[PDB]
Design a protein around this ligand. Structure first.
Ligand SMILES: [Mg+2]
Ligand SMILES: [Mg+2]
Ligand SMILES: [Mg+2]
Ligand SMILES: [Mg+2]
Ligand SMILES: [Mg+2]
Ligand SMILES: [Mg+2]
Ligand SMILES: [Mg+2]
Ligand SMILES: [Mg+2]
Ligand SMILES: [Mg+2]
Ligand SMILES: [Mg+2]
Ligand SMILES: [Mg+2]
Ligand SMILES: [Mg+2]
Ligand SMILES: [Mg+2]
Ligand SMILES: [Mg+2]
Ligand SMILES: [Mg+2]
Ligand SMILES: [Mg+2]
Ligand SMILES: [Mg+2]
Ligand SMILES: [Mg+2]
Ligand SMILES: [Mg+2]
Ligand SMILES: [Mg+2]
Ligand SMILES: [Mg+2]
Ligand SMILES: [Mg+2]
Ligand SMILES: [Mg+2]
Ligand SMILES: [Mg+2]
Ligand SMILES: [Mg+2]
Ligand SMILES: [Mg+2]
Ligand SMILES: [Mg+2]
Ligand SMILES: [Mg+2]
Ligand SMILES: [Mg+2]
Ligand SMILES: [Mg+2]
Ligand SMILES: [Mg+2]
Ligand SMILES: [Mg+2]
Ligand SMILES: [Mg+2]
Ligand SMILES: [Mg+2]
Ligand SMILES: [Mg+2]
Ligand SMILES: [Mg+2]
Ligand SMILES: [Mg+2]
Ligand SMILES: [Mg+2]
Ligand SMILES: [Mg+2]
Ligand SMILES: [Mg+2]
Ligand SMILES: [Mg+2]
Ligand SMILES: [Mg+2]
Ligand SMILES: [Mg+2]
Ligand SMILES: [Mg+2]
Ligand SMILES: [Mg+2]
Ligand SMILES: [Mg+2]
Ligand SMILES: [Mg+2]
Ligand SMILES: [Mg+2]
Ligand SMILES: [Mg+2]
Ligand SMILES: [Mg+2]
Ligand SMILES: [Mg+2]
Ligand SMILES: [Mg+2]
Ligand SMILES: [Mg+2]
Ligand SMILES: [Mg+2]
Ligand SMILES: [Mg+2]
Ligand SMILES: [Mg+2]
Ligand SMILES: [Mg+2]
Ligand SMILES: [Mg+2]
Ligand SMILES: [Mg+2]
Ligand SMILES: [Mg+2]
Ligand SMILES: [Mg+2]
Lengths: 120, 209, 122, 114, 56
RNA sequence: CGAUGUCGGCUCAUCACAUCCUGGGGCUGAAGUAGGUCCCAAGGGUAUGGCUGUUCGCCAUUUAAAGUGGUACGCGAGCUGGGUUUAGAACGUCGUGAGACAGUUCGGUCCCUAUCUGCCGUGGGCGCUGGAGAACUGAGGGGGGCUGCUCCUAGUACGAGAGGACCGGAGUGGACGCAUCACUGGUGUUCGGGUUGUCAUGCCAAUGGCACUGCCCGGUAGCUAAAUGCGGAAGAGAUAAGUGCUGAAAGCAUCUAAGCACGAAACUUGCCCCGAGAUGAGUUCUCCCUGACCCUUUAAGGGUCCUGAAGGAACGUUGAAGACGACGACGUUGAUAGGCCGGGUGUGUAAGCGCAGCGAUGCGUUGAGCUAACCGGUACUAAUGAACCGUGAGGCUUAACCU
RNA sequence: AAUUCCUUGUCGGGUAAGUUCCGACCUGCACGAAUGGCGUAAUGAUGGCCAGGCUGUCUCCACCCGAGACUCAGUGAAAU
RNA sequence: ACACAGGUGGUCAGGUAGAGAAUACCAAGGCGCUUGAGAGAACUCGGGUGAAGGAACUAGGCAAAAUGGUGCCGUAACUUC
RNA sequence: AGGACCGAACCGACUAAUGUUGAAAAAUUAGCGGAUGACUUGUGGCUGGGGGUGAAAGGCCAAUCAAACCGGGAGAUAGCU
């Protein structure tokens, strides 16, 4: 029925979405912009925004939870140092979805997900 | 009398000092205002047109905005009708709150049920599932036979098959009203009313009982 | 939810140790039996010197269910183990003398005062 | 939900002692025969606490003279009169449903003593 | 699951009458560049709403 | 016979009335209760099991009753394959034999993506004639219609006694249907925790992956039944069988011929639902549009420039809506969704450190930390301004009031 | 009885209820002694039958996780 | 018949746990299988879990469920011992 | 010691489901039987159509068997369609 049920499935395993979103989150905390389809972009926003919110206060325990999920010292290094103090005053959404054309191979409605860090 | 238009706002329990719990549904009935009255002199029947709620200044369209302008009332989120009981004519612009149910003991509720999509035959019509073993290949929850043979030669008009379940207007009647929270603009009914928590309800006094 | 083929326990000194409900009495096509509903049982296990033996088709009345009984506030009372008290078909009186294993207050219906008088608790 | 939370807070009884699962509670309940309103006790171990506003309910288990008896208690119901805890337990679960198999000596738990 | 007679070339074309495509019927003209692009999509140049959001 | 798969079971049924029950009556060798029998009646309901391949039947225990048949002895392009008529084997019997037996026994691949009709749902186009946005009327269809027990009446009527009412009323259940998660529970591979093996993050300490979610214990939202509410009806109209009144034909008599009144779960409504494609295309309310030139077989004509409203659509954020369309809310004059903050709820005392002990580990910090869909707020991110479609007072004849 | 048509023979046991099953009575349609007769420890992806355990086989299904089905893009059949 | 879930003899065959070449997680090395992207209906297939009852299912406990390891204690009728 | 026992390789194929215009002109998934022998298997030979071989089913003899396949009698014959 799906009534009030959230979280997209993306035709994949629960063990696949766990690791796909783990790596796709790590690419955005390594390049700040990535191109992907909408149903992945609408979901990447759901796992990075709570990740940045977690990285808002530096701690020993927070950097464990930041490493438990996302399993990367480097992404954790870019957080708490770069992306931690950068979005300290912005309260809420730390990313932005920008739609674009379609994939020529399979007609997927692509979109640009990016951190709000274009202006330097 | 006629009935009011409210909005289903969840359900709770109301404890009696005897000790019996009462499953009570809270019905938010705001100030129902009357936009138009109808008489046999122009409409052939005797009924009123109510409205409740508050739309936005950009959403109430021009044909709608002129309709609320003739009464001189605010623009609600919908319009409904209520057939009059021969001696209860109201005026255009009159606001009925909840007080008509100050003496009513049993009400009937009317609202659109929850939508369930394209439901199966065992779910929509309570057909029994076949044996899911012993030999049953590829047919566990199917309907099985749907008609006889050459003599009828066709499926009869009105066969219970798979289709759209729910998302239709139903009327669960003879519900006892528990407490008329007049100053909070509520209505407490014993039981369960159709509709999701937020979909409107046409509550009206019991015609059957 | 006591129904046909349900293996019960005996809650009094009548002679049986384990009985099996063969048909839930009452209404036609009745599926499950409840709190103090009458059922027809058969005796599957017995003591040697009892008033009854294996294979007696006598009635009973449920007393303790593993499903429970819901008091009118929603407070269910959930026993652990199905049990019953044997009856005397034509006259419906309890054939057992001392009923052990606490009963529920829903039995107080003018036909089971003899059971709620001989019960230890509740 | 300001409508619901208003109707929910007005009927909950504001004197419930905060207990935990594992505590051996002693519950007094208003049992009536219709005419004679009488208070009786119910001594047992708190099996689960399902605390949710007015609809909060907890269950306790008494191993009676026959077998184990469990009953849930509508916490804010008028039939529940007193829920004075006797002693306090120390367990590492929110719900002790595993005791439904443990009988006798195997179904005893420790005490906090803090 | 097999046809008894054959359908006509009439019945075929009647069935495809719903399979006709729909045009977009409107192109949004951008503020800055003035290119014609889809609504809520970036330009082929890579601008959106007035800003170089593709950085290419 | 260039193919109609022969039994029974499962499932889903539908019709007939020669009716098993409930309902309305006559007669009774009908006191009462309970029955016998016939007439009217098909609205609804019309067993679970042991043995058998069985339908059937017998048996056990219930029920208000566990109806009789048609529909390829309904239903294999829906499912079983036990029986029966494939190839193997054996026993009894028959025959010299190969083999044979409405004799028997053990084992034996059951195919098909649905063009059309039909049926269950759901949209597009055009019509409805000036267009658009809403609320209804209602033709005509469908769903629903079952019923026990106990008490009061009264343990009165009736009856030697034992027993033991109709009618009327109230309450409580069984089966079935509708609706709903507040409770009682189930699921809950998106939340928490425990733990085995092993690999990895350089190691210890902590974590992640994989092994059916690794295996388990609990659990939010949603869904859901075993859970919780509700429903059948009352009443009205016209009738069946039947009961009658008055009453001639036939001085009487008679329910009928004129005339009139009673009379069932069947019929028509009353209850709920779909419903103006009801082409007989309805009614009411409101809103919007009242600009100029040419040709002309000069006609409800064709074309251009100037203007294109109300509204719709499109795209977008999505929804307790949903297969896809559609439907509902919102589109910054913003709460539609995500995030965030607080709360609730769930799991149970995180990490690190300190201390006690050789140690596993415990205690304190701390009922902490982590908390998914839930509740109330807040524009931080995304719903961009425009554009597209749709037009410019709405034919003829006739009549009624005005001019 | 892998044999008994009549037949679910009749009695007893198992069961609330047993056309199958187990033990017997002989009225053996139509058992019978190497086309072997009667028993037999063990063994059997053997036949029949019963009890315990155990469970969604079922009472009666409910939910969830994936692969198709559904929508869009590419390619593109078949019996008939 | 194909870039087909099939068939094809012999040899080498590590680490941890384990009785083992079982099985599980890894090394070396080799691959993600030549259609994908969304939605999250009925229904179908591969599976998970389940209140009370527990074969009431059915031709039949078919299929599932379940038991399951190493030591030690202990183990009947019958028997060719 | 054993045509011994449990159990992989290997061989075999009892049950169920899927499949049955399939991935396959008899396979796959989850369980099963044997698994030191009357075993299995690689390589090369030998037995041939009224014949071969057969722990015997009238099974097998190149996806064909109560008498293979190919060519030739032969345009057999057909009171049948
Ligand atoms: Mg949501
Ligand atoms: Mg796909
Ligand atoms: Mg069934
Ligand atoms: Mg088969
Ligand atoms: Mg098959
Ligand atoms: Mg199947
Ligand atoms: Mg098409
Ligand atoms: Mg033909
Ligand atoms: Mg046949
Ligand atoms: Mg009727
Ligand atoms: Mg049966
Ligand atoms: Mg029968
Ligand atoms: Mg049996
Ligand atoms: Mg043969
Ligand atoms: Mg349409
Ligand atoms: Mg009708
Ligand atoms: Mg009555
Ligand atoms: Mg729960
Ligand atoms: Mg779980
Ligand atoms: Mg290492
Ligand atoms: Mg370590
Ligand atoms: Mg783990
Ligand atoms: Mg009536
Ligand atoms: Mg009349
Ligand atoms: Mg008459
Ligand atoms: Mg009729
Ligand atoms: Mg309507
Ligand atoms: Mg406009
Ligand atoms: Mg839309
Ligand atoms: Mg605001
Ligand atoms: Mg929000
Ligand atoms: Mg809490
Ligand atoms: Mg601690
Ligand atoms: Mg941890
Ligand atoms: Mg929070
Ligand atoms: Mg016999
Ligand atoms: Mg016998
Ligand atoms: Mg012989
Ligand atoms: Mg001889
Ligand atoms: Mg022999
Ligand atoms: Mg013998
Ligand atoms: Mg053998
Ligand atoms: Mg058994
Ligand atoms: Mg396509
Ligand atoms: Mg390939
Ligand atoms: Mg291959
Ligand atoms: Mg090794
Ligand atoms: Mg080792
Ligand atoms: Mg291996
Ligand atoms: Mg590698
Ligand atoms: Mg699915
Ligand atoms: Mg399971
Ligand atoms: Mg059991
Ligand atoms: Mg098995
Ligand atoms: Mg298994
Ligand atoms: Mg072989
Ligand atoms: Mg295999
Ligand atoms: Mg094996
Ligand atoms: Mg060879
Ligand atoms: Mg020829
Ligand atoms: Mg010749």
């Amino acid at each position: 029925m799906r009534h009030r049920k959230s979280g997209r499935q993306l035709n994949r395993n629960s063990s696949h979405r766990q690791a796909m979103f783990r790596n796709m989150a790590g690419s955005l905390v390594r390049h700040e912009i990535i191109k992907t389809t909408l149903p992945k972009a609408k979901e990447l926003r759901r796992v990075v925004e709570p990740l940045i919110t977690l990285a808002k206060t530096d701690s020993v325990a927070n950097r464990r939870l930041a490493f438990a999920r996302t399993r990367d010292n480097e992404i954790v290094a870019k957080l708490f140092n770069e992306l931690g103090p950068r979005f300290a005053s912005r309260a809420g959404g730390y990313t932005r979805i920008l739609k674009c054309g379609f994939r020529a191979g399979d007609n997927a409605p692509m979109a640009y997900i990016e951190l709000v860090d274009r202006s330097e | 009398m006629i009935g009011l238009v409210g909005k289903k706002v969840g359900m709770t329990r109301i404890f009696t000092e005897d000790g019996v719990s009462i499953p009570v549904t809270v019905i938010e009935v705001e100030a129902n205002r009357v936009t138009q009255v109808k008489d046999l002199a122009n409409d052939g029947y005797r009924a009123i047109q109510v409205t409740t709620g508050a739309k936005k200044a950009n959403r109430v369209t021009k044909p709608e905005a002129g309709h609320f302008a003739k009464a001189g009332v605010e623009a609600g989120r919908g319009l409904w009708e209520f057939r009059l009981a021969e001696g209860e004519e109201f005026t255009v612009g009159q606001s009925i709150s909840v007080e008509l149910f100050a003496d009513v003991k049993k009400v009937d509720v009317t609202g659109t049920s929850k939508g369930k999509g394209f439901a199966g035959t065992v779910k929509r019509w309570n057909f029994r599932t076949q044996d899911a073993t012993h030999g049953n290949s590829l047919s566990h929850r199917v309907p099985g036979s749907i008609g006889q043979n050459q003599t009828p030669g066709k499926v009869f008009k009105g066969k219970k098959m798979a289709g759209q379940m729910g998302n239709e207007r139903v009327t669960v009647q003879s519900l006892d009203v528990v407490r008329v929270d007049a100053e909070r603009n509520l209505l407490l009914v014993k039981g369960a009313v159709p509709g999701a928590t937020g979909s409107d309800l046409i509550v009206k006094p019991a015609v059957k009982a | 939810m006591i129904q046909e083929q349900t293996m019960l326990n005996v809650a009094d000194n009548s002679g049986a140790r384990r009985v099996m409900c063969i048909k839930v009495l009452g209404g036609s096509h009745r599926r499950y039996a409840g709190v103090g509903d009458i059922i027809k049982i058969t005796i599957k296990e017995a003591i040697p010197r009892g008033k009854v033996k294996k294979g007696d088709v006598l009635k009973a009345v449920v007393v303790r269910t593993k499903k429970g009984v819901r008091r009118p506030d929603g407070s269910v009372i959930r026993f652990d183990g199905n049990a019953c008290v044997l009856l005397n078909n034509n006259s419906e009186q309890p054939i057992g003398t001392r009923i052990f294993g606490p009963v529920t207050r829903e039995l107080r219906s003018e036909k089971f005062m003899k059971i709620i008088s001989l019960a230890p608790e509740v | 939900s300001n409508i619901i939370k208003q109707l929910e807070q007005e009927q909950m009884k504001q004197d419930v002692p905060s207990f935990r699962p594992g505590d051996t509670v002693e519950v007094k309940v208003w049992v009536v025969e219709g005419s004679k309103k009488r208070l009786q006790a119910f001594e047992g171990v708190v099996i689960a606490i399902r605390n949710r506003g007015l609809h909060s309910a907890f269950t306790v288990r008494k191993i009676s003279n026959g077998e184990g008896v469990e009953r849930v208690f509508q916490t804010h119901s008028p039939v529940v009169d007193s829920i004075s805890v006797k002693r306090r337990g120390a367990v590492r679960k929110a719900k002790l449903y595993y005791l439904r198999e443990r009988t006798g000596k195997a179904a005893r738990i420790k005490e906090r003593l803090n | 699951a097999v046809q008894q007679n054959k359908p006509t070339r009439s019945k075929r074309g009647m069935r495809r009458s719903h399979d006709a495509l729909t045009a977009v019927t409107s192109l949004s003209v951008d503020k800055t560049s003035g290119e014609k692009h889809l609504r809520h999509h970036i330009t082929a140049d890579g601008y959106y709403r007035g800003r170089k959001v593709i950085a290419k």
